[PDB]
């Protein structure tokens, strides 16, 4: 309750290292805030008696400094190491900088050091004496150099070591094997290199090992089988090569395994195909090969499977619907040279599916099957079914479908009306096909649709008026997409768009487009459009991109469109237009090919 005087000196030193005052602390000698540091915010005290200090003069001792998200700036003063009873130092998510005093890593009573999300820099101190530390958390800072080779010399109680999102380099020190009690080890997102020292596989209590985003190389040792408590293993984005070891019977707690973007080859180990515990599996972007085999009686926890962008061949496994928890499958860039199995009509757990660029044949059969997966919300068929016909068979219904992408298939046919059976559609991409006919008016009736890519087809006739009444354009999970490659994490990462470009469309642009106030992107380029440009286009308040180029448009560019305050890209190029322009800031390539 009454602040120890030596702790006050120490906290005073701590304040001196800061750029700005902490509210509630007595920052200067002026008796406004109380002088008792135990009264201050972020400071917790315990009596000297309860800490087992036998001093005749009792006092409250500072046991906890909890400063998270305080906008603290400046260095971490060497004086903090003068708080000899400090158990918890939590400075997470502040603006702090400078290097770390070796004195801090000398505190005998410290349980928790959380410096995460700051700007700290320099070498990490090589001598670390923290006999009481449970938690070493430096995640997201600017530290560089070798990980201290002596790191585990004195850390007898260590549970969590998080060095992730820093600049550390070199190999994982062989001494890492002496952190016997460690449960969480993150090294992820550093500069680390070389092979994993065999010594790491001695850490028997390890439940989370995160190595992703480094330069680590060599093989993945069969000694991995020794880390028997592993829940989560992430080796993604490294230089690892060879085969994935067959040790997954031994890791029976492993629910998360990500090896993606490595050099792995060979078949998936059969034990992984039998793993009872595995929930998230991502092997994508390797050289893995063979027939894909999954034992669905065994893998009852499997919820997400990403084998994409691998060297596998053979058929699409027909037993997959029997993995009854499996909700998401990314099978893209596996060259099946096959049809989707009929059993897929029974895959009722499936919510997300991508066969993109997988050599799938017979879109007719494929869709007649997949319509029966009642929970399917997203489907990616891009780059398959080359030159085939997009079936108009009316009996097709994808009821819960949110996202439908079949692009760059060169598909013949028209926009099929059975798509109106997907009333909750958010994203539709039919682009880069051979599609013909007119653009169906019922598209305007889809109240959740914010993204429509019809571009690069043979479409003729008018722009349907209903598009100007599109509700989501008028008014206000993991398996990412790439746009042709820029990554988008979910459907809503795509800004609302109408792309009708590279068709034969005719008629004019409707004034009612000005009703679409949530539209970010309108691309009408390379059509046969005629008439004027409505002044009502000034009504689309969210418009960023408007490309009318390569059309037959005439008249004046309405000065009113100057009212579009977010408009970042504008092209009227290669039309026939005349008169003044309101906007001096758009390049000439935007106005060129007009006369006037």
């Amino acid at each position: 309750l009454t602040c120890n005087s030596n702790d006050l000196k120490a906290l005073e030193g701590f304040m001196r290292g800061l750029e700005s005052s902490i509210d509630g602390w007595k920052w200067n000698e002026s008796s406004s805030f109380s002088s008792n540091c135990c009264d201050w915010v972020g400071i917790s005290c315990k009596s000297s008696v309860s800490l087992g200090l036998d001093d005749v003069n009792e006092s409250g001792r500072v046991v906890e400094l909890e400063l998270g998200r305080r906008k603290l700036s400046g260095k971490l003063s060497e004086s903090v190491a003068k708080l000899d009873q400090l158990k918890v130092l939590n400075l997470t998510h502040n603006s702090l900088s400078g290097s770390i005093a070796a004195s801090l890593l000398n505190l005998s009573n410290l349980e928790v050091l959380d410096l995460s999300s700051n700007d700290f820099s320099g070498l990490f101190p090589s001598l670390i004496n923290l006999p009481s530390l449970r938690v070493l958390n430096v995640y997201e800072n600017s530290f560089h150099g070798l990980i201290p080779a002596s790191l585990c010399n004195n850390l007898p109680r260590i549970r969590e070591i998080d060095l992730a999102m820093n600049y550390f380099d070199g190999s994982i020190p062989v001494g890492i094997g002496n952190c016997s009690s460690v449960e969480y080890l993150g090294l992820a997102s550093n500069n680390l290199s070389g092979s994993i020292p065999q010594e790491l596989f001695q850490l028997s209590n390890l439940s989370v090992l995160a190595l992703q985003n480094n330069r680590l190389s060599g093989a993945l040792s069969s000694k991995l089988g020794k880390l028997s408590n592993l829940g989560r293993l992430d080796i993604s984005s490294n230089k690892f090569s060879g085969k994935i070891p067959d040790v997954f019977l031994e890791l029976n707690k492993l629910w998360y395994f990500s090896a993606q973007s490595n050099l792995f080859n060979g078949e998936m180990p059969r034990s992984l195909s039998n793993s009872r515990s595995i929930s998230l599996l991502s092997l994508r972007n390797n050289t893995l090969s063979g027939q894909i085999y999954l034992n669905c009686s065994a893998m009852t926890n499997l919820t997400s499977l990403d084998l994409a962008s691998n060297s596998f061949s053979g058929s699409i496994p027909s037993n997959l619907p029997n993995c009854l928890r499996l909700k998401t499958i990314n099978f893209a860039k596996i060259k099946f040279i096959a049809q989707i199995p009929e059993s897929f009509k029974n895959f009722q757990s499936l919510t997300s599916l991508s066969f993109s660029n997988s050599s799938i044949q017979n879109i007719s059969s494929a869709l007649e099957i997949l319509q029966h997966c009642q929970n399917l919300k997203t489907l990616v068929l891009t780059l398959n079914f080359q030159k085939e016909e997009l079936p108009s068979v009316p009996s097709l219904q994808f009821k819960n479908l949110k996202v439908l992408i079949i692009a760059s298939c060169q598909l013949r046919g028209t926009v099929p009306q059975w798509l109106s059976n997907s009333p909750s559609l958010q994203l539709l991409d039919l682009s880069w096909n051979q599609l013909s006919g007119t653009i169906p008016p019922w598209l305007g009736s889809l109240n959740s649709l914010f993204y429509l890519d019809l571009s690069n087809n043979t479409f003729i006739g008018e722009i349907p008026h209903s598009l100007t009444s599109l509700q989501s354009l008028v008014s206000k999970p993991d398996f990412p997409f790439f746009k042709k490659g820029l990554q988008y994490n979910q459907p809503s990462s795509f800004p609302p768009m109408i792309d009708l470009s590279y068709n034969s469309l005719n008629g004019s642009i409707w004034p009612e487009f000005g009703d679409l106030r949530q539209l970010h992107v309108l691309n009408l380029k390379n059509n046969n459009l005629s008439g004027n440009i409505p002044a009502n286009l000034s009504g689309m308040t969210s418009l960023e991109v408007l490309d009318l180029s390569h059309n037959n448009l005439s008249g004046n560019i309405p000065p009113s469109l100057v009212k579009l305050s977010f408009l970042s890209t504008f092209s009227v190029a290669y039309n026939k237009l005349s008169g003044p322009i309101p906007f001096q800031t758009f390049p000439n390539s935007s106005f060129e090919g007009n006369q006037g």
Binding site: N285, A308, A332, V380, A407, F482, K483, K484
Partner: peptide, 5 residues
């Protein structure tokens, strides 16, 4: 267009 990988 959109693909996955």
């Amino acid at each position: 267009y959109i693909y996955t990988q």
